[PDB]
Subunit: 901 residues, 2 copies
Amino acid sequence: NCTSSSATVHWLGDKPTYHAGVTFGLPWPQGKYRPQETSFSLTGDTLQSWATGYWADGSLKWTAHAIAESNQIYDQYTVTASSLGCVKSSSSSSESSAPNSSIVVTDNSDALTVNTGEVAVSFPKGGNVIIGDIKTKSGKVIGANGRLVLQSQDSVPDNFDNRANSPIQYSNFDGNINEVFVNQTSARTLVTVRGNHTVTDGTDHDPWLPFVVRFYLYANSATIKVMHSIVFDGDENDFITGLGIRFDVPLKGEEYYDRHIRFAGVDGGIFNEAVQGITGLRRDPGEEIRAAQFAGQKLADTETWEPRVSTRLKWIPTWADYGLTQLTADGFGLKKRTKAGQSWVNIPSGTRAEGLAYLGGATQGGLAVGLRDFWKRYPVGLDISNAASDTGELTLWLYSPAAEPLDLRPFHDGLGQDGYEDQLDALEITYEDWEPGFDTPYGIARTSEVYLFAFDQTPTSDKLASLTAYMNDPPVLVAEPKYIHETQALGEYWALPSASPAAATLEDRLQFIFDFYKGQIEQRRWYGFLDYGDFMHTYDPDRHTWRYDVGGYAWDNSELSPDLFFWLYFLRTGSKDAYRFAEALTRHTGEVDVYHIGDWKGLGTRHGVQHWSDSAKQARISQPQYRKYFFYLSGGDERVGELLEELLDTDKTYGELDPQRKVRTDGWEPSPNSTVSFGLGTDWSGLAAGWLIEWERRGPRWEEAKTKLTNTIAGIANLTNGFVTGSGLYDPVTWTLGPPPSDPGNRGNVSISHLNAVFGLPEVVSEAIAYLADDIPKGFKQAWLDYCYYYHASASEQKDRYGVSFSKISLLQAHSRLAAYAAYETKNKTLALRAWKDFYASDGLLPDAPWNITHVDGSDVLVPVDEAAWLATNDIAQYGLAVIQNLAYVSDSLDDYQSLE
Amino acid sequence: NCTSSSATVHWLGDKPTYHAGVTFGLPWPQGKYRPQETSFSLTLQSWATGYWADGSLKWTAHAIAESNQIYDQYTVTASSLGCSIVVTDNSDALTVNTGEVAVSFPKGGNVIIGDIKTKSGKVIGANGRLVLQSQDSVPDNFDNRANSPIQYSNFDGNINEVFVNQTSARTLVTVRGNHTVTDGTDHDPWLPFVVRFYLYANSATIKVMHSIVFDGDENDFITGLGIRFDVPLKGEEYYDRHIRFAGVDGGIFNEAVQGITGLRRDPGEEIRAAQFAGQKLADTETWEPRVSTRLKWIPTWADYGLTQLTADGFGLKKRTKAGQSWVNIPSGTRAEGLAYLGGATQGGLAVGLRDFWKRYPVGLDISNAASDTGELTLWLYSPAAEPLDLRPFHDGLGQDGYEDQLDALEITYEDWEPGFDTPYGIARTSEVYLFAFDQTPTSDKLASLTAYMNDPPVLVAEPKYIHETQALGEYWALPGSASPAAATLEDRLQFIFDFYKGQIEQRRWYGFLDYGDFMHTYDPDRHTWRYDVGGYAWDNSELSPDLFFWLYFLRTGSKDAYRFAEALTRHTGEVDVYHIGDWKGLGTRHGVQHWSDSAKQARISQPQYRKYFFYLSGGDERVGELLEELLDTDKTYGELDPQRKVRTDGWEPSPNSTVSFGLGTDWSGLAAGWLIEWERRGPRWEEAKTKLTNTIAGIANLTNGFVTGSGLYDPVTWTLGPPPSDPGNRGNVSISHLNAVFGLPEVVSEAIAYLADDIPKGFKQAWLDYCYYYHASASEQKDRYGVSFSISLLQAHSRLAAYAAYETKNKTLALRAWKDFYASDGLLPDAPWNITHVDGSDVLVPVDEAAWLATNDIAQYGLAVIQNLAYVSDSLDDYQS
Ligand SMILES: [Ca+2]
Ligand SMILES: [Ca+2]
């Protein structure tokens, strides 16, 4: 019979003044709603839907929803779910109403056309043009031949002087379409276009730099959201110099004085000009003619002016090109010229441009284009070309050619390092684990969030400033935290913020950590095309800088799961700032810090001076768990969907590359057609998170992932030392897990690492135990409980059980949460107290650490900066997770712990 | 018998923390002191810079050594008659030795500083060389670079002449030359240069005036311009080699070639703190051995580069060596543009550019710091920037001949012509500083030296004294108000100053060539100054802003005021004037580019504009040089007619043939130039004296005086006769509003006073008549001259009435001067007299505006206030009636 329930959803911060349609996710409790048998309705104070994840029983876990662009914006949106037996025992009569707007698509051998009711855009199925043309509802074309432009060069001169004696061969490229896909729905439609960049001008060069561009169009919207994603293919010789998206804007028929150029400036500023300026001449055509051009309206017929002006328009210059370059994160330049062959006139410019340009006119219409977080991702640009011609160009440079070309080559030569002993010895001084030919960016990726806007006529500047604001803070709808928690669709291991004054200062200290790391991004200028979203790993208290030049201490690359902390922090709080911080991080770490092709497809690169410089290529960085939260909140963002699917191939890498090669003291080395060795902590937490997720989404490979997950859970269980076992051997035909090389026949092996639990293990393990339910392999849960308990048992408790004590245990604050979990699962108050003692005593960040920032200025530093010095990113990340998880599992013990002193 | 007096001299603003030797100037009264006989003491190195008519001292200049002891004031006593650096000559190169540093300058070759030694004898840097890179075309757009590759060419500075003005306290080394190719496509020598090195006793800072004259084709695009040194560091260990960069507002960046801080293992807290402080690291045996072994594994960083390519942002980066990627370094907004390379034991050098970010694109490179020899490079124009493109900004838009050209002038206020859109012969001067160090200095010192170069302390006379000597005109006085009406005038002058000082920042009027100028008229609809409409963009000294801002300094003493007037003069005197070629000595009319207009005219180069700075600086040798160039201005009147377009007449110019001079518009700029050389007693002073006195008597023996609009000048006889509209001199009347507003009243007042009793009969009266009759009734202008006029900038010209009022003791005239001031054109007293702030989506960035004014109005408003107060401030109380 009938089952129905509601969940509410809220704007991430303040209520928007404009949105362009929006997708959101909603969790649902285990077993409540069958797929295909569940309708969903929208209440806005007074619904397009689909599934993104499922429970082990097959019921709905997460769904995504989509609402059209709308004048009417509410403070909150309430979805109601209804089982199908809810309307198949009804005897009432609903009106079936038509939506006021609804998407339609036409299909053809040549092209694919999506009509929202405000625009219609065509997507060629082949060739060197992504978007064929863009029409308003009028029918008129406002822009056309959207194409991807790449430019490269085959070498770099040693320095500026070397230019005269070092030839650079420049080469241009076009986006070649290979595949076009579609997700049609009435409320929004997603066109996914995969491709390749191919030569146009300059030297013949294999096609390269694969792409996939996603176009989101919503009913009733003239706004297209564009998720441009490129994987890097090149080698020592392919230096990128220009990367961008370009449109023709047809202006023929428009008087020059009716053609309009707008660039977004600083803080909701807009730059307002026309191709032929009528304002500030020696003579005046009339107050209202001038006001009108400034406003972007069609100017009165020539006959009504003062004739002093109309007769001499042949002598007023005519500005064909405009250029805006943002080459540092703190200043941009702006210039125009009359045409090629003449010098540019410099325009008064400023600090940080919000990254939108418009080209068009009062009659012919036109389009605006922009990049989200424009200046934060320098070097970038905005070009207008040939605006005094029949067809204008409008270009967004994701990488400005006015910048130095993008050099991805190694930052050093090896410093003489010959083989592992030397490499390991460098590790001891710089924390860098170098290896020859491993400092490579081959396979890394980056996504960019572009927006397109179509106009029937030049819009007001206020509209342009609004769309600019919009683009840079795209409205998000999210589930209430309390509801996400009750559903348990996203972990047992966190809960909301208790009366303990101890607990209250913990919350303050998580806020402190967050406020600090948010501010540092600005202060240390962790900005730029590849860099933005990451932060650094450790500080230099002498120089007052993050150790950007000392091997492993530089870019943090998700070391010790800061990604879990900041996402868990967002879940618990619903803070806008927190989501944005984690959004940015997840777009960096998932794209730039992991390999998407090549022999290492599915491994990421350990923390280093470059995001790819270190040899340790491991699954703990690619760690799918770090993406799960943002995948599901957000309505199954299809890019991350793809990234998660890519990771299913990670097990294949342990045949090509063993992460322990340099330290493994057994015989082992991978060989062909043969069981492969990986870790049970670091490596297996990566593998399992990915398998769990494929199973959850019921994607192409879900059975397989279910098998690999369940068999390895059984293999660890059957290993007589469980996780404490060093870490075993995996068969890539049978999908099973045996004991390691140093112990065939499972007699008992012991290898402990402070790193095994801190890259997702407890989080994946808890979800896996929860998902598998009654089908869980016998005594796997005991083995996990074992690891959790013996890790900071006494040395004699360890020797008793496993044969030897664990001398090299550290990160005791970090592992406090493993006791906390065990304390909850066994209902043991003493084990609970141990979690808190390890949290508050032991290591990491102690409660009596400074817990403040120092300001540093004058001649000590380049710029004024705030600093810790007493903390490092490893510290805060595990602290943060310790606070959250110990509070989830054992808050009932915290005042008890506190009252004993 | 003794004549003795004292004059005191004060810092510009606050007492400086540090100076590196200073030259200042003092005026003296007409007839007080003879040149070789007068001696000067302090509480002193001295020379004459200008003189009065009878040969007595007018302006002196003085130098003091660098001193740890610094005073609030310095008092110079002069007494009438009846009352340390070491230079050495090898047959090869010359060394100046201040006591603290010792610099060798070759007399030829492509190296300009041979070596720099500290007082111990250690060579801290060597091979000072001028550097230049160019390219031969630019692409149309970025896509065009595949199909149109381009020929780069490196050059360096070849020396031709070297001069030495040597004195005990100060020693100026001048080095002329040009840029002579090395690597890249063959190319003739070009880009003539001059580098003046000032060295003072007991200083290791060297001030460096690097001037350049652009003399290339449409095909010469400059991609890089700079000064470069070698820094030795052979003995020094990688972790004892230190790199600094000035950052933002007191900031310094502090690294080392091989860093020992931030490592996985600590060598020692004391060690780590020492590298950070630029000290020699204790013996490696005293380190933690986990760090001292394994030093091999810590990378060395040879190459550092700071690029400042906008006024609001710099990037900073580091590289192990070539063939590896750079690593980006946390950076910021506006770097103050000093770099240091050197070591704890081997010593080093710092270079920088005054006003660095304000003159973008600039850069600082350090290179090969992990090698036997390092390179340290100031880039006055940075390679990381787009090439410097001085070609014209339009193609002519199909203008053909003077009828079209004057038809465009009516809508865009631009007078174009083909071939006149040319930067050939413009110049630019950069103020660079070198600093020599026996060992890596403290970061605190580096910051102090950075602070110093960006605000070089200046020593100036008291305003009461300057005015009292009358050695810079009688046409201004100190503020000290008596009426509330005068007080409001003062407050309005600060309003004008604060607003313009503001707009430089707000409208980013910065850059290599731009910084120092401002713009002409405002577009009130776009809320932008009119940067893109012909003659409404860069002001290029129109209506004598330079006169207003310099006179505003004289009156007040304001540091801000001097600094503004200075930056202006460094622009207008250099990039707005031509220094070589056929137009040498003329400047370009206000435009979109500084050189785009076809009206090349002496009203713009007007030597009066540079006179106040020339003396107050203590004889700035570069402004001195520029003032000599302007003595050739007359030659151009046989090579270009300013009226070639506005002529229903047939006339044309040839060399040594007679020409028409407008008596304000052409003659006052020439008289200015001639009056200055006579005052200085320069190489052409006899020439100058006769050209001035001839033409001054010329104008007196015209029947109608200045009222006769113009004259006819013989280049052969150096004399001035009636205009071709009235040979035989029965009488002419021609009046232009343009004649008084470009320094005419200033030159005439000064000349009358200069000549004294040797003034030609009836010159002063011919002037008073212009001053009286310009805006008298047409009943008073027919009743003499027989043909009543047809008066157009009454506020501006109110000054003239006031001069005549002072001189005639005529209270009717003074009140008319105040009526014309307060109640006609220009800035009326009822005008808004406030700013409007503008933001949101109307503009790119937020701005304050005053659309009710334009630069022409403030320039002439400011002169009228200053001048009317000086001459007729008694008559101001009475005008309130
Ligand atoms: Ca990274
Ligand atoms: Ca100028």
